Amino acid sequence: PMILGYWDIRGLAHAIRLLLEYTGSDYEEKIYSMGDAPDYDRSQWLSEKFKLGLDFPNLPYLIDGAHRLTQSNAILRYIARKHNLCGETEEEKIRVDVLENQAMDTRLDFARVCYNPDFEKLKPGFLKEIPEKMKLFSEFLGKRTWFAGDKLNYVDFLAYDVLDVYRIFEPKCLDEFPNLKDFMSRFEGLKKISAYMKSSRFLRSPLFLKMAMWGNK
Amino acid sequence: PMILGYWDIRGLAHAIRLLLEYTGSDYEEKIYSMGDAPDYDRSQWLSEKFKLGLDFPNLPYLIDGAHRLTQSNAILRYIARKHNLCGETEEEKIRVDVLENQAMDTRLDFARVCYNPDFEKLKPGFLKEIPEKMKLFSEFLGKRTWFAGDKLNYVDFLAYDVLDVYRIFEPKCLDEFPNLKDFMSRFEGLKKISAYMKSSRFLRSPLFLKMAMWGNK
Numbered sequence: 535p536m537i538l539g540y541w542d543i544r545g546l547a548h549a550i551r552l553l554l555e556y557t558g559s560d561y562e563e564k565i566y567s568m569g570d571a572p573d574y575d576r577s578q579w580l581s582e583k584f585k586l587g588l589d590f591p592n593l594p595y596l597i598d599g600a601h602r603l604t605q606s607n608a609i610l611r612y613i614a615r616k617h618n619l620c621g622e623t624e625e626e627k628i629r630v631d632v633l634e635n636q637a638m639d640t641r642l643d644f645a646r647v648c649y650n651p652d653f654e655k656l657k658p659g660f661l662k663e664i665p666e667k668m669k670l671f672s673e674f675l676g677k678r679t680w681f682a683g684d685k686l687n688y689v690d691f692l693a694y695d696v697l698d699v700y701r702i703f704e705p706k707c708l709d710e711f712p713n714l715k716d717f718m719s720r721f722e723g724l725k726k727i728s729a730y731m732k733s734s735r736f737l738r739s740p741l742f743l744k745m746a747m748w749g750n751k
Numbered sequence: 752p753m754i755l756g757y758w759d760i761r762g763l764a765h766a767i768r769l770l771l772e773y774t775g776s777d778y779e780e781k782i783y784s785m786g787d788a789p790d791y792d793r794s795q796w797l798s799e800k801f802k803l804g805l806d807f808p809n810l811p812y813l814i815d816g817a818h819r820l821t822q823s824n825a826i827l828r829y830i831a832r833k834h835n836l837c838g839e840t841e842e843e844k845i846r847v848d849v850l851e852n853q854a855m856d857t858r859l860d861f862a863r864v865c866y867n868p869d870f871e872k873l874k875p876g877f878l879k880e881i882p883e884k885m886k887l888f889s890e891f892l893g894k895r896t897w898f899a900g901d902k903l904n905y906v907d908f909l910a911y912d913v914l915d916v917y918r919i920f921e922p923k924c925l926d927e928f929p930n931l932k933d934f935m936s937r938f939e940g941l942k943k944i945s946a947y948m949k950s951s952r953f954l955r956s957p958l959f960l961k962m963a964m965w966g967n968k
């Protein structure tokens with residue numbers, strides 16, 4: 535089976551878990567636990583990090599036979615090729631490339647704020663940036679079934695995970711965009727995703743590592 | 752003619768310009784200039800930002816026929832797809848995917864320090880971090896001619912641009928890696944590339960925007 539290495543948090547492995555479950559891949563998770571406060575000890579990973587044959591050692595990682603990957607985007611693209619979940623037309627590939635990159639920008643915009651000691655003073659400002667962030671995703675999807683079009687795609691896993699993080703922070707932030715509200719429901723209604731969510735394997739939280747000012751529990 | 756729109760700096764358009772040149776593409780540049788002083792003025796851009804039909808308005812952007820892209824990586828993937836410049840085996844595709852995301856993290860590791868108001872304090876600490884990053888690239892390249900193997904890939908343009916930016920900051924940072932020194936020479940020796948970097952167009956600098964603490968010219 536595949537090995538997904540990551541911390542015992544949700545973080546950048548959420549979309550990879552969802553794609554591994556959607557695609558029915560045979561995987562196990564190699565879980566690393568970060569020590570508690572003052573130190574936030576990483577030696578559970580730091581002692582294995584250079585012993586795994588990885589080119590740029592990092593978390594998450596994916597071992598699949600002879601292939602060892604880091605970088606979650608590279609990992610999603612690797613599973614997506616295995617199961618033909620990449621764009622088919624030029625227009626699809628452009629939408630998939632733009633949204634994958636835009637989704638990481640959108641994710642880090644919020645992670646910069648939570649990982650910041652000034653979280654409480656930046657939060658009112660950040661809250662007011664959220665509707666315009668969400669309107670961009672809303673208009674991009676339009677009346678499409680999935681973000682790249684009719685066919686589901688790995689970027690839908692990224693868009694689902696990033697849009698899900700925002701509504702956990704601001705629960706009303708999708709209320710004014712029904713096509714996004716509906717895209718989330720249709721994503722959670724997929725048979726193998728819904729089964730996964732009703733299983734013990736599902737890890738809802740923490741969203742971030744222990745030292746973040748939000749989503750650390 | 753395709754249009755590449757970006758600020759009047761090097762920045763995230765450097766690898767895109769290079770790849771437009773190597774592929775011999777018909778492009779013109781829409782150049783936005785920023786104000787000096789306090790209030791680094793952005794009106795030249797912000798007056799057009801939502802009038803270009805970009806789904807996620809941003810710089811850089813690429814216009815080409817009906818296709819209107821933002822996000823530098825997605826722009827490069829687009830130009831590369833057009834001229835058949837991405838991986839073909841599964842192994843090359845993984846190396847391209849891993850390095851592309853890796854190159855952006857390495858860039859942002861450097862960009863965060865230079866734009867930080869405390870750059871002067873964190874300068875020496877970041878410098879002792881550089882040899883370890885370069886060892887990672889050197890070991891990844893190995894004895895390969897290019898970074899995904901035998902044929903030139905758009906990721907070689909990212910790796911060239913990121914390694915060069917480190918080279919300028921720390922001129923001795925490649926010395927213990929003939930590997931990468933050879934690679935920079937081999938890349939600079941590409942025929943259409945050299946015709947361009949000897950040109951007066953060639954924007955070797957400013958690396959960053961005017962408000963960075965280093966690389967703003």
Ligand SMILES: N[C@@H](CCC(=O)N[C@@H](CS)C(=O)NCC(=O)O)C(=O)O
Pocket residue numbers: 545546583591592593594604605606607852856
């Ligand atoms: N761009 C990378 C980010 C990697 C990253 O930030 N990893 C964090 C987890 S949130 C880490 O703790 N890495 C540990 C290390 O590299 O030693 C990706 O997509 O995977």
Ligand SMILES: N[C@@H](CCC(=O)N[C@@H](CS)C(=O)NCC(=O)O)C(=O)O
Pocket residue numbers: 635639762763800808809810811821822823824
């Ligand atoms: N992740 C994006 C970054 C986009 C970005 O940061 N653009 C900078 C230029 S260095 C900017 O100032 N954009 C202005 C804007 O968004 O209006 C990419 O790779 O293209």
Ligand code: NA
Pocket residue numbers: 724725726
């Ligand atoms: Na299904």
